[PDB]
Design an enzyme around this catalytic site. Structure first.
Site, PDB file in Angstrom:
ATOM      1  N   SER A  20     -11.065  11.814  -3.894  1.00 49.18           N
ATOM      2  CA  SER A  20     -10.607  11.498  -2.534  1.00 49.18           C
ATOM      3  C   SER A  20      -9.116  11.159  -2.576  1.00 49.18           C
ATOM      4  O   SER A  20      -8.545  11.007  -3.661  1.00 49.18           O
ATOM      5  CB  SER A  20     -11.399  10.348  -1.933  1.00 49.18           C
ATOM      6  OG  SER A  20     -11.242   9.176  -2.707  1.00 49.18           O
TER       7      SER A  20
ATOM      8  N   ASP B  35     -15.653  -3.386   9.243  1.00 53.86           N
ATOM      9  CA  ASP B  35     -16.779  -2.860   8.464  1.00 53.86           C
ATOM     10  C   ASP B  35     -17.574  -3.901   7.672  1.00 53.86           C
ATOM     11  O   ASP B  35     -18.515  -3.549   6.948  1.00 53.86           O
ATOM     12  CB  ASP B  35     -16.278  -1.770   7.511  1.00 53.86           C
ATOM     13  CG  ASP B  35     -17.364  -0.778   7.129  1.00 53.86           C
ATOM     14  OD1 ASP B  35     -17.974  -0.179   8.045  1.00 53.86           O
ATOM     15  OD2 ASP B  35     -17.596  -0.580   5.912  1.00 53.86           O
TER      16      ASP B  35
ATOM     17  N   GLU C 127       0.830  -1.182   0.000  1.00 53.24           N
ATOM     18  CA  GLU C 127       0.000   0.000   0.000  1.00 53.24           C
ATOM     19  C   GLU C 127       0.873   1.243   0.000  1.00 53.24           C
ATOM     20  O   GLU C 127       0.711   2.124  -0.855  1.00 53.24           O
ATOM     21  CB  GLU C 127      -0.915   0.040   1.231  1.00 53.24           C
ATOM     22  CG  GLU C 127      -2.180  -0.803   1.112  1.00 53.24           C
ATOM     23  CD  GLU C 127      -3.074  -0.434  -0.058  1.00 53.24           C
ATOM     24  OE1 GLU C 127      -2.971   0.690  -0.594  1.00 53.24           O
ATOM     25  OE2 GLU C 127      -3.908  -1.273  -0.443  1.00 53.24           O
TER      26      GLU C 127
END
Length: 129
Positions: free
Chosen positions: A50, A101, A35
């Site tokens: 975003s 989530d 990442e």
């Protein structure tokens, strides 16, 4: 701050990510690797406007506030700049919310594409944990 592989592993272990929601430590280290390449200051803008922040590339549309993402939800209740700090506490806390989530670690595309189903244990090999 660019973390060393074992240094990050130990920090994540200390924060309680080993087997958090069923994901072993190698998973988290691997996600961080692909990442952000272990860099707390990494940022990446997305097509929808975003931006992803930090070592875990947390997105501004839902989890944090960067003051420039119309419609952002700020679920971790933190300014996005906090995810860039050399202290990964905020990132770890927010990631714990994310992984819970409902979609687990699939929330991280790099994880899904490069870590999922691989020998993630290799990521913590050689480290004293």
């Amino acid at each position: 701050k660019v973390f060393g592989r074992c240094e990050l592993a130990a920090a994540m272990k200390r924060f309680g990510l080993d087997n958090y929601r069923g994901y072993s430590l190698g998973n988290w280290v691997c996600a961080a690797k692909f990442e952000s390449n272990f860099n707390t200051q990494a940022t990446n803008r997305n097509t929808d406007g975003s931006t992803d922040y930090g070592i875990l590339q947390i997105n501004s549309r839902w989890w944090c506030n960067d003051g420039r993402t119309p419609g952002s939800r700020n679920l971790c209740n933190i300014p996005c700049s906090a995810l860039l700090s050399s202290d990964i506490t905020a990132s770890v806390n927010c990631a714990k919310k994310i992984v819970s989530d409902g979609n687990g670690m699939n929330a991280w595309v790099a994880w899904r594409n490069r870590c999922k189903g691989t020998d993630v244990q290799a990521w913590i090999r050689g480290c004293r944990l």
